[PDB]
Amino acid sequence: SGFRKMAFPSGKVEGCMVQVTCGTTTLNGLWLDDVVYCPRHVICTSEDMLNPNYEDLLIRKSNHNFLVQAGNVQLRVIGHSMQNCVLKLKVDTANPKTPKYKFVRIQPGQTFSVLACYNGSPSGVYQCAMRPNFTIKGSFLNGSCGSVGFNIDYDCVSFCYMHHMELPTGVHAGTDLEGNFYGPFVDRQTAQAAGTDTTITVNVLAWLYAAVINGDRWFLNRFTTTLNDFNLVAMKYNYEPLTQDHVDILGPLSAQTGIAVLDMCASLKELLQNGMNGRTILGSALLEDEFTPFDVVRQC
Amino acid sequence: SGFRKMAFPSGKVEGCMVQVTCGTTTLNGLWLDDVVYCPRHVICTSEDMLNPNYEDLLIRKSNHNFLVQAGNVQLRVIGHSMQNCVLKLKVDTANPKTPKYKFVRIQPGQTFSVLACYNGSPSGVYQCAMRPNFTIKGSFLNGSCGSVGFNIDYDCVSFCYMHHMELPTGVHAGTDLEGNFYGPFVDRQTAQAAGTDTTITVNVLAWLYAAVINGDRWFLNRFTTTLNDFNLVAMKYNYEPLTQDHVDILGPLSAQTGIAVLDMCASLKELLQNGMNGRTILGSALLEDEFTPFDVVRQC
């Protein structure tokens, strides 16, 4: 029994974290095969960030300006190129611990584990969701840029996130491993704000299913609803629309519990329109939305 | 910025997990140097658990009855000793991935990371607190016994917990790595109940300080309280008594923020007496008590 916000084991990713230094800036890089990936703003001073032309700033850099250390060992940079907002530093040595891996771009609402790092040293591991506004509510202190997020499937590590920046509101933004930012953010010092965040409806439902599976059933009811009627209510409470693809992804949990997705949707409607009235679900007083359907199945 | 439930990186511990089988029972063992540690009830059938005589059951055991597998490879057992409720299996090969390590017995209120494991295979990592009633609220599914809890300090793993059992209430119980149970529990199928759980007041306070540091400060107020007056209220809501040693532990966070500990105790008193009135702190609707003062300092 038991249900916790659970991160993937981080060993495979710990073996890939390295330290990258350009001038006074030190941050983290990801060492896979003979390439080290890191944020391209590693080449910028704080003053360059006002209006940087990364193409120019990178033309003025030599491989010997990039200091890469894997633990105590220095790694010789022998080439460099920029892909969107990520710098690719080719090194003379292939990471002998490179796991089987992929680069994937996740959709809002998807979860991943984050290996927080400082000057190449892993500090902690926690679970995150890509918010619908393409921010993440993480814990990234100074020297954490280049920390990565990932999921693991059958010994294969799917890297999905690299940390680049923090807004004045304290929320975090970054890129996939091809350098494309999630959300409307840019790696320069200009005005940018995250849109209004919403609740990940399909994840709340998956979590309610986790509650049932774990014996918490007080919120269940006999009632059913239609998808349109549910989303009309969902709209009002700042929930993301529930699509028929969501209903399909929830099918396996519906089967395990014998509760139709639309039966559970009526339970959720009632919680939105009446609150909880002092009770809790899985020990939470709010509806949790950072568990995907797949997270629940993996842990139930 | 940001504050999150954070586990230590699990790599060093993953390299220690093995599978231990005695008859039909399979669970997890911890492989350090040439010794494997596991719960001694690995030697019990479902029938033995009623009133088990561990000493008698082990007199009929040979080293070749214990099958240990590290990945795809078998590890030859060449000896055994029982220390309290932990079985120690001497093996012919020293784990080449043995980290620097120590065995420590934690106190209630302290936190540690748990590497949940299944048949020697890591499944996930999460952060736990030893409850004041010497239970833990984890996620331990089939094949989870022998999973360990730990802290990491300067490349050294301090193992503090090994998972043995789950009470009827769904809470979890275990031992230190010398086999001494936390709390009044025993490894036999007998009626067992956990004492009354209380809220870890000093941890709730450290978490309120984590909130302030991160800009979440709506709950602050001008008012102060005495330690005795605070504890009169706290007791009513099933909080642990706050001692002067607790107040002293909060000192560094008090200094960082300029909020005297007893001023924060009056903010907490008001939250207990009036609720949150719909707001949240660090995104939680309930007061969080599984962050120690040291945990907050590490992440802030």
Ligand SMILES: *C(=N)N(Cc1ccccc1)N(C)C(=O)[C@H](Cc1ccccc1)NC(=O)[C@@H](NC(=O)[C@H](CC)NC(=O)OCc1ccccc1)C(C)(C)C
């Ligand atoms: C990565 N290792 N770091 C260092 C760091 C991490 C955590 C806390 C402090 C420092 N970071 C996050 C960076 O190097 C990035 C680089 C960057 C700068 C600007 C735009 C994009 C990337 N720094 C930041 O994320 C900074 N954020 C900002 O400067 C934001 C960006 C919109 N603007 C901002 O805060 O403007 C007001 C302001 C106030 C005070 C100082 C500077 C700017 C940072 C979080 C470091 C302020």
Ligand SMILES: *C(=N)N(Cc1ccccc1)N(C)C(=O)[C@H](Cc1ccccc1)NC(=O)[C@@H](NC(=O)[C@H](CC)NC(=O)OCc1ccccc1)C(C)(C)C
């Ligand atoms: C460890 N690898 N496992 C396997 C497992 C993990 C999770 C879920 C199912 C199986 N576990 C936890 C064990 O082997 C231990 C061994 C044990 C048994 C009895 C006392 C001490 C250790 N099993 C348990 O923890 C079981 N717990 C109990 O039997 C508790 C002990 C007080 N009593 C109990 O549950 O009484 C009601 C009851 C209900 C159903 C069957 C038997 C008894 C377990 C959680 C597996 C029931």
Ligand SMILES: [Cl-]
């Ligand atoms: Cl909550």
